[PDB]
Amino acid sequence: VNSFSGYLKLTDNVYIKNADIVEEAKKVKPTVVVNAANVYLKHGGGVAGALNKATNNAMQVESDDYIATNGPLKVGGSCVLSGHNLAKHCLHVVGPNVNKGEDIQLLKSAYENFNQHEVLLAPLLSAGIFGADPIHSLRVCVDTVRTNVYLAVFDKNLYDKLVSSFL
Ligand SMILES: NC(=O)c1c[nH]c2ncnc(NCc3cc(O)ccc3F)c12
């Protein structure tokens, strides 16, 4: 039993909800919140911009130190950093950004990072400003992630479409 509330169950391990991931994280304080990161951990917009703003820019300060030490992530890769006031940990996961021409096949590799954590609050990878089809992202999620994932979908119109079209 966990503290997530109001999710629709899609499969044995995948759950979905119309919610603002920032507000959901503040309420649940999950062990792991997933950020829709880019390889530079520059949290300018989308989910990343919103998660960072909620931390009063502490996420960005920590991220800049991480990059200065370790260099950029790989597309499809991830790193674990602090969750600040939102969660115990933040798993920064880089899905391909279609508006940069990156291979959509890397979306599966990106979701594989979730399997290193028993329970996660997450957005759909590569959705929103990363330019991928959220219906496809949900399909890859369900077919790749085996751990317990709670998906927060910001747009109410999009959520109903994902549910209604889910096979
Ligand atoms: N600034 C942001 O994007 C977000 C900030 N918090 C969030 N919490 C959950 N979902 C989000 N985006 C999902 C989304 C995907 C899509 O394809 C179209 C619209 C849309 F809203 C965001």
Side-chain angles (χ1 to χ4, degrees):
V1 180
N2 64 51
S3 165
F4 290 100
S5 180
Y7 284 76
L8 174 68
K9 183 175 180 56
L10 293 176
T11 67
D12 174 73
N13 66 299
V14 178
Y15 294 79
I16 196 167
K17 183 184 181 178
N18 168 232
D20 187 343
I21 192 170
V22 169
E23 284 307 305
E24 187 75 2
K26 284 194 289 184
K27 150 174 130 52
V28 177
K29 290 296 235 76
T31 306
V32 179
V33 67
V34 173
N35 182 31
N38 57 51
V39 294
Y40 305 112
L41 303 179
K42 284 172 58 97
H43 310 301
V47 169
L51 289 174
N52 175 66
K53 172 178 177 184
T55 75
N56 184 43
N57 210 51
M59 178 181 284
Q60 190 64 67
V61 171
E62 177 195 31
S63 293
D64 287 350
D65 171 83
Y66 173 92
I67 297 286
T69 298
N70 300 107
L73 296 183
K74 303 173 180 178
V75 179
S78 70
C79 68
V80 180
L81 290 173
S82 179
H84 300 276
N85 52 317
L86 304 175
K88 191 174 192 302
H89 303 107
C90 179
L91 182 69
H92 295 272
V93 179
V94 184
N97 187 324
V98 170
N99 309 317
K100 300 179 181 179
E102 295 167 350
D103 175 15
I104 193 67
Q105 298 299 131
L106 291 166
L107 187 54
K108 187 172 184 75
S109 298
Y111 273 116
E112 288 172 341
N113 294 285
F114 289 25
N115 289 321
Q116 301 294 317
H117 303 276
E118 289 194 351
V119 180
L120 315 88
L121 171 62
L124 288 168
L125 298 178
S126 297
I129 70 176
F130 282 61
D133 181 349
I135 297 181
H136 176 65
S137 182
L138 175 57
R139 187 74 260 165
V140 178
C141 180
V142 162
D143 294 339
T144 304
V145 182
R146 300 178 299 284
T147 55
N148 295 139
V149 54
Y150 290 84
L151 294 168
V153 178
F154 180 62
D155 188 70
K156 168 61 171 172
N157 286 328
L158 172 57
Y159 169 83
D160 288 344
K161 184 189 188 124
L162 292 162
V163 168
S164 292
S165 64
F166 183 67
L167 225 197

